[PDB]
């Protein structure tokens, strides 16, 4: 029951994710690793999930990394710029490719990149995510989760993966989360609003008919409503910690140059 509009734009959706995400992280590499007051405030705007690490070496070897508990908290904190660089630069290509946003004024292109990098990143990464190992597999790479569940699921990121996991969603539906998140218009900095806009509602008019078509069973019901509801929640996640973030920052510096330019640091004052 799709129109032919509307099935060109999931198809180049797709284009767009196919050469943009490399779903086996086979080209990062040269990556840091854990080396072989204000400051009782920045203890509680680190990552509050403890994670464990795993590199599967390619002829059969097994590196793993236990972290230790509470500036040693501060270790992981290299390793976490470098893949967060390596996602930022594939999130910045797939926006470039789409027509849509190739069309958007250049300084509408970098304000619309600034307020949804984090989000895309989240949304990519539940794709690599196992809820039941709890453990994001990104090719050698993996972050498992320390050892319940329960009490675990209470950080607003953790319960957001367990859910968006549980609605077992489509490629294409997570392909057209992106897209409404990366097409936002109360982005800070946003100049054509109005054009934003109608590409936002597009996108998402195309997410509802595409789940009226594709789904008709009840454990379906409400789906798309479902997803519009989660990107609410995972923008305000993204709120939290982008001030999480530039408080550790000006404590502990560790942005990489793509990340201060996506965060609005200059280098100077």
């Given at each position: 029951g799709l129109t032919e509009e509307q099935r060109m734009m999931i198809r180049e959706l797709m284009d767009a994710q196919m050469k943009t995400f490399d779903t086996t992280?086979?080209?990062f590499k040269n990556f840091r690793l854990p080396g072989?007051?204000?400051?009782?405030?920045?203890?509680?705007?680190?990552?509050?999930?403890?994670?464990?690490?795993?590199?599967?070496?390619?002829?059969?070897?097994?590196?793993?990394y236990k972290p230790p508990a509470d500036k040693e908290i501060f270790s992981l904190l290299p390793h976490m710029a470098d893949m967060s660089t390596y996602m930022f630069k594939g999130i910045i290509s797939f926006a470039?490719?789409?027509s849509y946003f190739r069309d958007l004024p250049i300084e509408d292109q970098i304000s619309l990149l600034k307020g949804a990098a984090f989000e895309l990143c989240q949304l990519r990464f539940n794709t690599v995510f196992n809820a039941?190992?709890?453990?994001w597999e990104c090719g050698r790479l993996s972050y498992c989760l320390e050892d319940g569940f329960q009490q675990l699921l209470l950080e607003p990121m953790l319960k957001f993966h367990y859910m968006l996991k549980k609605l077992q969603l489509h490629e294409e539906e997570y392909v057209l989360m992106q897209a409404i998140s990366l097409f936002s218009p109360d982005r800070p900095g946003?100049?054509?609003?109005?054009?934003?806009?109608?590409?936002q509602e597009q996108f998402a008019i195309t997410l509802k008919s595409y789940i009226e078509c594709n789904r008709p069973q009840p454990a379906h019901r409400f789906l798309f409503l479902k997803i519009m509801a989660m990107l609410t929640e995972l923008r305000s996640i993204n709120a939290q910690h982008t001030q999480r973030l530039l408080r550790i920052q000006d404590i502990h510096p560790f942005a990489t140059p793509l990340m201060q330019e996506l965060f609005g640091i200059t280098g100077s004052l």
């Open positions: 992280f086979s080209h072989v007051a204000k400051w009782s405030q920045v203890r509680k705007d680190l990552c509050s999930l403890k994670v464990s690490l795993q590199l599967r070496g390619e002829d059969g070897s097994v590196w793993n470039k490719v789409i039941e190992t709890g453990t946003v100049l054509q609003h109005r054009v934003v806009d109608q590409l």
